[PDB]
Short mmCIF file of N, CA and C in Angstrom, two decimals:
data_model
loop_
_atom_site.label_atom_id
_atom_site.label_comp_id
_atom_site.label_asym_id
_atom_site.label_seq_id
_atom_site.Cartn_x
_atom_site.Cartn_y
_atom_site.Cartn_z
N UNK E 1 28.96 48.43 -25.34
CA UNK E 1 28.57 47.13 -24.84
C UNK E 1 27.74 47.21 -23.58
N UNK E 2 26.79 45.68 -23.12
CA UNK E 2 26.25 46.04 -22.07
C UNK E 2 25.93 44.15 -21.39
N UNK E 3 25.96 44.85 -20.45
CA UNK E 3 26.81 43.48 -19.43
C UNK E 3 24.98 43.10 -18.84
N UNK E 4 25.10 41.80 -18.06
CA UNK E 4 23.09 41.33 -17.97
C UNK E 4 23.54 41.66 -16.48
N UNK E 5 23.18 40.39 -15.91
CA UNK E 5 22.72 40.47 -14.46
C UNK E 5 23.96 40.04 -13.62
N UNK E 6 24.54 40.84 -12.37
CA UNK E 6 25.78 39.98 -11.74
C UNK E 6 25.23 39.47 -10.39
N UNK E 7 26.44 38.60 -9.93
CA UNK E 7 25.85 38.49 -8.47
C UNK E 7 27.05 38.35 -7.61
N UNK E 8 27.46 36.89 -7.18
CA UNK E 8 28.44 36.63 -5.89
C UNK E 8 29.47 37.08 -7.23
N UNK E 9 30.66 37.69 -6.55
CA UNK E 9 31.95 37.58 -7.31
C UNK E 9 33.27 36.74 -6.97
N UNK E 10 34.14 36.90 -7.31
CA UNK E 10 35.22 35.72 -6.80
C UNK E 10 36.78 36.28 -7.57
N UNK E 11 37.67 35.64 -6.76
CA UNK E 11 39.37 36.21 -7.08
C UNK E 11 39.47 35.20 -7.66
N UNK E 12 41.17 35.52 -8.33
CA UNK E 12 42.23 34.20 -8.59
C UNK E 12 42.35 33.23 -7.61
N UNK E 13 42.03 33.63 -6.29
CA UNK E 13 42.68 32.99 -4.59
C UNK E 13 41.74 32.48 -4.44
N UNK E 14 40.41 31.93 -5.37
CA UNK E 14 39.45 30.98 -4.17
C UNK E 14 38.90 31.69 -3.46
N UNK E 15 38.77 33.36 -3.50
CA UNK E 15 38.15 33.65 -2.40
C UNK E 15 36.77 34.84 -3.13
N UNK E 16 35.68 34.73 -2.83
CA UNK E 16 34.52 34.86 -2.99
C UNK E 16 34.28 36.60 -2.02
N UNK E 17 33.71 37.38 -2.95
CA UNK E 17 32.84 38.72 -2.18
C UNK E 17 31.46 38.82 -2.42
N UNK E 18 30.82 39.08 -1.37
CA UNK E 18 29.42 39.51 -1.69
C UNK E 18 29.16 41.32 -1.58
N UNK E 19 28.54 41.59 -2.10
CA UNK E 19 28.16 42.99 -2.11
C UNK E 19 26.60 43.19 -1.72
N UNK E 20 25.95 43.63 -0.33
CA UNK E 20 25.06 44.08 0.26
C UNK E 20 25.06 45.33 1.19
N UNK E 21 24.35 46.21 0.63
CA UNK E 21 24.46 47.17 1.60
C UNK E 21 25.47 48.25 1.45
N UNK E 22 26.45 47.62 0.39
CA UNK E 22 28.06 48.17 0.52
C UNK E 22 28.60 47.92 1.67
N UNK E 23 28.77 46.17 1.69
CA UNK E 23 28.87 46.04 2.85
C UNK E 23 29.88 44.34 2.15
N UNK E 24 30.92 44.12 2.16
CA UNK E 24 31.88 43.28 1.44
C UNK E 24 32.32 42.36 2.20
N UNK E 25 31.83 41.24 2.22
CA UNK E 25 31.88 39.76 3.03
C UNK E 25 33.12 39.06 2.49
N UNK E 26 34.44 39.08 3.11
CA UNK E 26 35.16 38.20 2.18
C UNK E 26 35.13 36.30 3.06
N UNK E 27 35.58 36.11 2.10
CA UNK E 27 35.12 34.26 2.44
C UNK E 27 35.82 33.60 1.42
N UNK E 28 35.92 31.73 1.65
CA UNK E 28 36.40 31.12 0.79
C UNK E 28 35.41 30.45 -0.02
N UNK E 29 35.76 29.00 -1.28
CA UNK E 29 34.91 28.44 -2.53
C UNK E 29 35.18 27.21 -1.39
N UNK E 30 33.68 26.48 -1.89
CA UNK E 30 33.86 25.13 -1.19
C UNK E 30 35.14 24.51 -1.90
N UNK E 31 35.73 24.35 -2.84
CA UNK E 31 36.89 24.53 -3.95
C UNK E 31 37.99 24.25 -2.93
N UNK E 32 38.17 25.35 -2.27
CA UNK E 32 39.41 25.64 -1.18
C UNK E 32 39.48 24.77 -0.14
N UNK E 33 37.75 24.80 0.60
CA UNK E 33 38.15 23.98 1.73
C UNK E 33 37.48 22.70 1.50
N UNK E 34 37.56 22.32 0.40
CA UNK E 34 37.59 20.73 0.10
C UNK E 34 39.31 20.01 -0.33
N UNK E 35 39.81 20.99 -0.38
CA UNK E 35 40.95 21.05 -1.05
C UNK E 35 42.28 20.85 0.22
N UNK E 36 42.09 22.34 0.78
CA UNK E 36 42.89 22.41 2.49
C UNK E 36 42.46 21.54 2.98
N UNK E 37 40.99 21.09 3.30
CA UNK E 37 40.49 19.59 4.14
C UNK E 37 40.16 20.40 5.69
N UNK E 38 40.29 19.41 7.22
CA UNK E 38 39.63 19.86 7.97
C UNK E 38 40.27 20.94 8.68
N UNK E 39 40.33 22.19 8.71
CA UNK E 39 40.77 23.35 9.29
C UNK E 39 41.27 23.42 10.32
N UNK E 40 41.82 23.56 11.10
CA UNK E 40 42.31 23.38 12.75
C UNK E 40 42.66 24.59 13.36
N UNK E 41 43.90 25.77 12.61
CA UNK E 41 43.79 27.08 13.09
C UNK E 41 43.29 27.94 12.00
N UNK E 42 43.05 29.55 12.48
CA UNK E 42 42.76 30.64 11.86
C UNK E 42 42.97 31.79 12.12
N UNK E 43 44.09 32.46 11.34
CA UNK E 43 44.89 33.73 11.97
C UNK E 43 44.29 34.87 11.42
N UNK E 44 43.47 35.51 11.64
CA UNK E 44 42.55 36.53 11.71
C UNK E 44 42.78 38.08 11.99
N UNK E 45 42.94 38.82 11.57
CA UNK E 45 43.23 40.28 12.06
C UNK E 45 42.33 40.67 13.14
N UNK E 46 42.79 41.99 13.44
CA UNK E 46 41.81 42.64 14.79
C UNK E 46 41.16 43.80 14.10
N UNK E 47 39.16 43.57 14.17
CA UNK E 47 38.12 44.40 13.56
C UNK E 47 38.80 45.66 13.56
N UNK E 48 38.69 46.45 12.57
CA UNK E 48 38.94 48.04 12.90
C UNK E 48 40.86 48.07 12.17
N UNK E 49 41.05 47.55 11.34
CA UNK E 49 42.39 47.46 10.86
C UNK E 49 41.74 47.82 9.20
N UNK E 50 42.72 48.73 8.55
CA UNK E 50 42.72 49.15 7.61
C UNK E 50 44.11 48.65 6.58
N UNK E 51 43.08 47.58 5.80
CA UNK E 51 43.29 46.48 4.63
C UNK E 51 43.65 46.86 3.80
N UNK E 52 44.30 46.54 2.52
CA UNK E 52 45.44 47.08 1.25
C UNK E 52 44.55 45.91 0.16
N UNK E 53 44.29 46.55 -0.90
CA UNK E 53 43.81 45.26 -1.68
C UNK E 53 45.19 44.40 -2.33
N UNK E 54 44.66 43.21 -2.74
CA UNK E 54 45.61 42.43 -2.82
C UNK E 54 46.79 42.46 -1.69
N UNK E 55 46.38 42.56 -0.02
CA UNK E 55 47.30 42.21 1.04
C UNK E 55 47.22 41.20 1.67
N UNK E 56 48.36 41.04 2.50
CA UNK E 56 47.91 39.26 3.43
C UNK E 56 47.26 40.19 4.53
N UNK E 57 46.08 39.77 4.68
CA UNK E 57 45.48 39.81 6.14
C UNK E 57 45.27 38.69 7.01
N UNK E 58 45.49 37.06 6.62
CA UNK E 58 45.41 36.16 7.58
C UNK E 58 45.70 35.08 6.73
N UNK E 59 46.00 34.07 7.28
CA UNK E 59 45.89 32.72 7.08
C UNK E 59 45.59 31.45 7.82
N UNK E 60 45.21 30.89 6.72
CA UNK E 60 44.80 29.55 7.23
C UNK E 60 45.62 28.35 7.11
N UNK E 61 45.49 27.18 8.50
CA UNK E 61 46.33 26.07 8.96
C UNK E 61 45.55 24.97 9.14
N UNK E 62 45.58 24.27 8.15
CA UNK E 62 45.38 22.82 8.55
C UNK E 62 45.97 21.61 8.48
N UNK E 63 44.96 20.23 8.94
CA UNK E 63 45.88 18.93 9.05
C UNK E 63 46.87 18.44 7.65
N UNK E 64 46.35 19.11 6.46
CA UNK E 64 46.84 18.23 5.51
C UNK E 64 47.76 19.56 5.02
N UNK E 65 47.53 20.82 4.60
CA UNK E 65 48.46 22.01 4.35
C UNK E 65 48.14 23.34 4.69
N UNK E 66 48.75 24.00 4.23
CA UNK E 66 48.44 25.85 4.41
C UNK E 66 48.28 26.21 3.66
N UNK E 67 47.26 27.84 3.51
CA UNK E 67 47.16 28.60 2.35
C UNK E 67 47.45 30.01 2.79
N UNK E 68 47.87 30.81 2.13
CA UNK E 68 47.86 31.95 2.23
C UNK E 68 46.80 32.98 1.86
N UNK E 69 45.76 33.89 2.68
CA UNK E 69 44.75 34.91 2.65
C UNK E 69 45.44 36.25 1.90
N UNK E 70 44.05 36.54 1.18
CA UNK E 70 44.66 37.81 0.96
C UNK E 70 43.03 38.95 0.41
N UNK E 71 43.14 39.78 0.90
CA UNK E 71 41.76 40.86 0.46
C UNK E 71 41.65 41.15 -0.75
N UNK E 72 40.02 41.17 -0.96
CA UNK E 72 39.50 41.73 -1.99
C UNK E 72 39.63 42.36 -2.79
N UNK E 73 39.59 43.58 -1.79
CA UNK E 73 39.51 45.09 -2.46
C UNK E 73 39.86 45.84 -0.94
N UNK E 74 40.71 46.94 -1.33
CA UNK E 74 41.01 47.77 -0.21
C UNK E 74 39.49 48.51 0.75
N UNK E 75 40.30 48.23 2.21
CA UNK E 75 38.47 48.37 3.00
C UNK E 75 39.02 48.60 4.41
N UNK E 76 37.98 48.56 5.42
CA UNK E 76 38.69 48.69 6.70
C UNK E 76 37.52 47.83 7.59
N UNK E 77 38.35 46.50 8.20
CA UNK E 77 37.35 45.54 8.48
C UNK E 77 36.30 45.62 9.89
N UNK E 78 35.06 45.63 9.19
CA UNK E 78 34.17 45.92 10.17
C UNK E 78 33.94 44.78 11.16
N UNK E 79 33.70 43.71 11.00
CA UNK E 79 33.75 42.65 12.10
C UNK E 79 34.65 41.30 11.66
N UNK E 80 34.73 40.59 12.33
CA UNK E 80 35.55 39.16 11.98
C UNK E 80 34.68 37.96 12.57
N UNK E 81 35.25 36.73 12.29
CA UNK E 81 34.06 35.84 12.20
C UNK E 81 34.47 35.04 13.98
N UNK E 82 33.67 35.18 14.70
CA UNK E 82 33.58 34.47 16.14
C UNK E 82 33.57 33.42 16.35
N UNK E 83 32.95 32.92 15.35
CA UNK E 83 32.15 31.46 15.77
C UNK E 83 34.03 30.72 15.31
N UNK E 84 34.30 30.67 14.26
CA UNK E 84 35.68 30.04 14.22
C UNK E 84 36.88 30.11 15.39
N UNK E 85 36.52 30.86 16.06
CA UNK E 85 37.50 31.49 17.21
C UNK E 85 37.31 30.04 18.18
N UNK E 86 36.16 29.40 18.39
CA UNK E 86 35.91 28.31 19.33
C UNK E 86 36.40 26.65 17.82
N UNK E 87 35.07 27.29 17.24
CA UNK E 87 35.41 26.15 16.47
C UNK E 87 34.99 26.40 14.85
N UNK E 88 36.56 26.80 14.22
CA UNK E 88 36.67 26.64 12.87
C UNK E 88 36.68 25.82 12.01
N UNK E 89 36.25 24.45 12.41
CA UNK E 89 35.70 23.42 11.28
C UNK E 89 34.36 24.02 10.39
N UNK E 90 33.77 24.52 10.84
CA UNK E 90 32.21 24.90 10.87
C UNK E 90 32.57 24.98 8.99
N UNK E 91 33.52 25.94 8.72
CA UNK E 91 34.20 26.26 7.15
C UNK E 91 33.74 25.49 6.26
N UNK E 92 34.19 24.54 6.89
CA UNK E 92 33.92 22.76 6.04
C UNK E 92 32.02 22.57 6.11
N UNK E 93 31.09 22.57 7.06
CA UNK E 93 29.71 22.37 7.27
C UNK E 93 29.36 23.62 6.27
N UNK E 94 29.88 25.09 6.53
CA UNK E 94 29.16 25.82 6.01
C UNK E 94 30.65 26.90 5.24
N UNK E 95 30.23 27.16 3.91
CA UNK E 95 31.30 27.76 3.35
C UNK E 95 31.28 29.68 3.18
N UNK E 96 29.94 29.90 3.24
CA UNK E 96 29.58 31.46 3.57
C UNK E 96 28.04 31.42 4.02
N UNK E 97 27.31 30.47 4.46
CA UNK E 97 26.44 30.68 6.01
C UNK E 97 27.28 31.19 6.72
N UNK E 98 28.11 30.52 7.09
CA UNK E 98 28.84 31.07 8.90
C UNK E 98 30.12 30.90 8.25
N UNK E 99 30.81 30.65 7.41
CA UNK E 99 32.09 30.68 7.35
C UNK E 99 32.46 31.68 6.58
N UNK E 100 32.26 32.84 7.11
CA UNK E 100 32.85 33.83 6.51
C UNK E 100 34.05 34.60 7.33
N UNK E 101 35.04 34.23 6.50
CA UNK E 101 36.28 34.84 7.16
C UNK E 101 36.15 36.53 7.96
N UNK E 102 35.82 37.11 6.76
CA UNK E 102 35.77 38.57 7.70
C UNK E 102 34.92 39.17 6.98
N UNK E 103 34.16 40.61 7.61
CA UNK E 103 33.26 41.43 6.96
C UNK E 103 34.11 42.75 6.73
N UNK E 104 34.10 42.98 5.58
CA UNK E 104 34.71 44.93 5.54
C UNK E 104 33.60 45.33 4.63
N UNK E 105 34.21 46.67 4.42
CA UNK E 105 33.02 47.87 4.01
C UNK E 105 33.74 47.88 2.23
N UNK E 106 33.32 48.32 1.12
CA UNK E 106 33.75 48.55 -0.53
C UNK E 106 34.01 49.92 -0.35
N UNK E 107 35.51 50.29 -0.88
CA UNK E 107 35.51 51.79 -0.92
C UNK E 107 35.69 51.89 -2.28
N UNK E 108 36.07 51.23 -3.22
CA UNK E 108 36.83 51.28 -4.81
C UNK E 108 36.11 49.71 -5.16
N UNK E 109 34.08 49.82 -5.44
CA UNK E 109 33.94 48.36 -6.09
C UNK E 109 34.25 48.38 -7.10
N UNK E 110 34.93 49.59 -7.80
CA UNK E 110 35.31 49.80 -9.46
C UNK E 110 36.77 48.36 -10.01
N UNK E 111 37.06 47.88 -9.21
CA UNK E 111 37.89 47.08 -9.22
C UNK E 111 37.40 45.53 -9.21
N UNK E 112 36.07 45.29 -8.63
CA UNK E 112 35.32 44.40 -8.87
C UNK E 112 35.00 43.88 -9.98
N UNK E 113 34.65 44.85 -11.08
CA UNK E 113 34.63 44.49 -12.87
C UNK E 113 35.88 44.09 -12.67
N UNK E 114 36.92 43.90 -12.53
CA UNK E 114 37.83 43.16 -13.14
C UNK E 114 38.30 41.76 -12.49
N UNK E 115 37.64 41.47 -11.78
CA UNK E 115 37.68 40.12 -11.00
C UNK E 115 37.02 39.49 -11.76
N UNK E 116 36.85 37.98 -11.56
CA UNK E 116 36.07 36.91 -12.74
C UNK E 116 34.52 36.73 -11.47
N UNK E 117 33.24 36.72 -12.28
CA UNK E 117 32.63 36.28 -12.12
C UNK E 117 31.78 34.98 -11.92
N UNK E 118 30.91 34.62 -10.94
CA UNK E 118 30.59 32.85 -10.74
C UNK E 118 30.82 32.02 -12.48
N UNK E 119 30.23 32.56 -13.23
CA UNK E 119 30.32 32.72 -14.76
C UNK E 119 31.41 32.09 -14.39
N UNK E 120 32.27 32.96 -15.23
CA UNK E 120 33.88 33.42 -15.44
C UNK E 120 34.56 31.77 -14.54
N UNK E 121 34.47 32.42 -13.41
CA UNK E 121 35.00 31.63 -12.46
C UNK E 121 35.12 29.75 -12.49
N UNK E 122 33.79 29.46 -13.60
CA UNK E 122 34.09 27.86 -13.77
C UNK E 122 34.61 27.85 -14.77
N UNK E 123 35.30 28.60 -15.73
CA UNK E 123 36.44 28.41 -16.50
C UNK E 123 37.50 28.09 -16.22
N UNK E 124 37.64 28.86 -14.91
CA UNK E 124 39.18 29.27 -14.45
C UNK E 124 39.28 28.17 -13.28
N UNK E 125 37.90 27.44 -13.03
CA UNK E 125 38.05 26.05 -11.41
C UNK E 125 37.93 24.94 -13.10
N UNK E 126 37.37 25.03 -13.91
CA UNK E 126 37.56 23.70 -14.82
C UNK E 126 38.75 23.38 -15.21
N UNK E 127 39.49 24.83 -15.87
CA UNK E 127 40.69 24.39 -16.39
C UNK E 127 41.82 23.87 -14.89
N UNK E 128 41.18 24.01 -14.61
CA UNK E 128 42.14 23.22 -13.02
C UNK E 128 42.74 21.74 -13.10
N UNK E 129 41.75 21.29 -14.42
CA UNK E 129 42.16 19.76 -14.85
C UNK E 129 42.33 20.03 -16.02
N UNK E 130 41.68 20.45 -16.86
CA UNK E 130 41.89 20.80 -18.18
C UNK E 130 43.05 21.69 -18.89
#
């Protein structure tokens, strides 16, 4: 068999990777934070911490509920997002312009084929009503 063209990928959790550089942006679906609503805190790890795939590395707190974070793919996070540190509404204005939870590095993207694709992925946000 032979697979066409891929691009952004995405978890079970609403949460979205990009792959540049070998360079693994994790972030949330406008999905999530239309859903959580307006953001207020954001518990964030410290850059330079070495991540477990499928681990909690942070979560998020807002006015209406909570969700629980969790990584990609096992990595060791190269920067975290600043601008939320003052003011994490931004999430809501921008969902991966500037709202990107954290940046890590891909050591195992072989695990990526098995995540659902943007494709894939409006199956699995449709049947959400269906």
């Amino acid at each position: 068999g032979s697979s066409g063209s891929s691009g952004r990928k995405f978890t079970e959790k609403h949460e979205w990777i990009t792959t540049e550089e070998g360079i693994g942006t994790v972030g949330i679906s406008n999905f999530a934070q239309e859903a959580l609503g307006d953001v207020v805190y954001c518990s964030l790890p410290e850059v330079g911490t070495k991540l477990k795939k499928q681990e909690e590395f942070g979560a998020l707190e807002s006015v209406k509920a909570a969700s629980e974070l969790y990584s990609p793919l096992s990595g060791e996070v190269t920067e975290v997002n600043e601008a939320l540190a003052e003011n994490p509404g931004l999430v809501n204005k921008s969902c991966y312009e500037d709202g990107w939870l954290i940046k890590m590095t891909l050591s195992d993207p072989s695990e990526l084929d098995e995540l659902m694709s943007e494709e894939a992925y409006e199956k699995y946000v449709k049947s959400i009503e269906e």
